[PDB]
Structure 1
């Protein structure tokens, strides 16, 4: 699919940089015709077929196709797509309260954790209902609308690894951040919606404790820890955490994807259920 090839600078003015990654940079922007504000994600294109640099058209089109499907309060939305010879430029909904990752750098109570968690689960429920696996859930990819309120509202971002799961699983060597990936990702096995639920377990552990359950001193150690389900609830961190909260985590950090809680299970779990 081809995108708008007019110069994006004819329609938008850019400002503060919001984030920067391997082949993408995200800039605050403002649409000239409406005065409305967005985030422009510039994705660097592959310059040749066999290059390892830039993002393949196939990967870019997948992210765009998924984003086009999405409309939910807890997920980023897509406004427009432009492209030129060097970049595809996604004009995305602006979320200006910063990463959940940075908010955490400022442990939560179980109430604070569950208030974030419920919104995350609601967003993931929407996605999984559409058979969309995110595959890169982590605090850096959870953005707050406003960080200076008692109960910040959040939105899931970064669909760069997201896949449609029309057949129950995808077998593609999809692979995110070692701390957050499920054992089936580590082992290069077929992947489905279940991998997201593991990531939610890791996120929940971090929300409650300020500590990462599988983090080793090197990437290979972290990955080895993940595959072995080498984690425990340290008393120093979890002494005043409820057994029900631990139960929620324990039922997500399960090696066999088939035995892992689904998104629907997680919403009905007694720690979450109203």
Structure 2
């Protein structure tokens, strides 16, 4: 699939940089024709077949195809796509309140504050999983706040760079996210399904409640070994006044066997979450 090949600068003015990763840089921008503001994500293309620098066209097209499907208050939306020799440029919805990660670092939350974030995350993931989309990279840096200066910030899930359609219940690809947040089936290179996201949600919940990462070791290999062994516990110093029901919720997500793990529907009916 090809994208708009006119110069993006003829239609948009860029401003402040929002952030950058290994292959992407994201800049605030403003569309000239409407005055409306967006986030322009520049993804560097691969320069040759075999290269490791840049993102393969297959991977870029997958991300764009998935983004085109989605319209939900808790997930980032796609406005337009441009490209030139060097980059594909995604014009995305602007979410300007920063990462949930940075929000956590500036402030543990109360259980109310934690569940207020978590419920939005669950709703976004319920939408995605209902469309058979696995995100595969859920973590606090991929949750963006609309406005961080309100008591209950609204959030949107971003970064669909590892996302896949799961049309046969599982996928068997080169898929590996951030060690602190990946499920054991990812660590063990096994077929992956929607269940992997639910594990990541368990890790996020543990962090929201305690300010500590449940599997984090001194090196990435230690973290991955910890994940595979389900080597986590609820430290009393962090969890002494946390409700047992919140611990139960986490415990039913951080389960090695993806078949016994709570699904997104299970998580919405769980007594800690259900109204």
Q: TM-score, normalised by structure 2?
A: 0.99
Using the alignment, how far apart are the partners of 1:183 and 1:28 within structure 2?
36
* Equivalence map 1:42-191=2 (5 Å): 42-106=42-106, 107-191=108-192
Q: Could you tell me how far 1:186 is from its partner in structure 2?
A: 0.1
Runs (4+) of structure 1 moved beyond 4 Å?
Answer: none
Q: Could you tell me how far 1:173 is from its partner in structure 2?
A: 2.5
Structure 1's unaligned 5+ residue stretches are none
**Partner SS state of residue 199, structure 1:** helix
Structure 2's unaligned 5+ residue stretches are none
Q: Could you tell me how far 1:215 is from its partner in structure 2?
A: 0.1
Using the alignment, how far apart are the partners of 2:50 and 2:100 within structure 1?
36
Q: Could you tell me how far 1:41 is from its partner in structure 2?
A: 0.2
1:130-151 deviation line (CA, Å, top 9, x unaligned): 0000000000000000000000
Using the alignment, how far apart are the partners of 1:48 and 1:118 within structure 2?
43
Contact 1:128 1:263 in 2 (8 A): yes
1:135-181 deviation line (CA, Å, top 9, x unaligned): 00000000000000000000000000000000000001300000000
Q: Could you tell me how far 1:201 is from its partner in structure 2?
A: 0.1
Using the alignment, how far apart are the partners of 1:65 and 1:132 within structure 2?
11
**Partner SS state of residue 135, structure 1:** coil
Using the alignment, how far apart are the partners of 1:143 and 1:165 within structure 2?
25
Contact 1:173 1:185 in 2 (8 A): no
Using the alignment, how far apart are the partners of 1:50 and 1:193 within structure 2?
30
1:111-146 deviation line (CA, Å, top 9, x unaligned): 000000000000000000000000000000000000
Q: Could you tell me how far 1:88 is from its partner in structure 2?
A: 0.1
1:86-116 deviation line (CA, Å, top 9, x unaligned): 0000000000000000000020000000000
Q: TM-score, normalised by structure 1?
A: 1.00
The count of corresponding residues between Structure 1 and Structure 2 is 274
- How much is the aligned-residue C-alpha RMSD, in angstroms? 0.3
1:178-200 deviation line (CA, Å, top 9, x unaligned): 00000000000000000000000
**Partner SS state of residue 257, structure 1:** coil
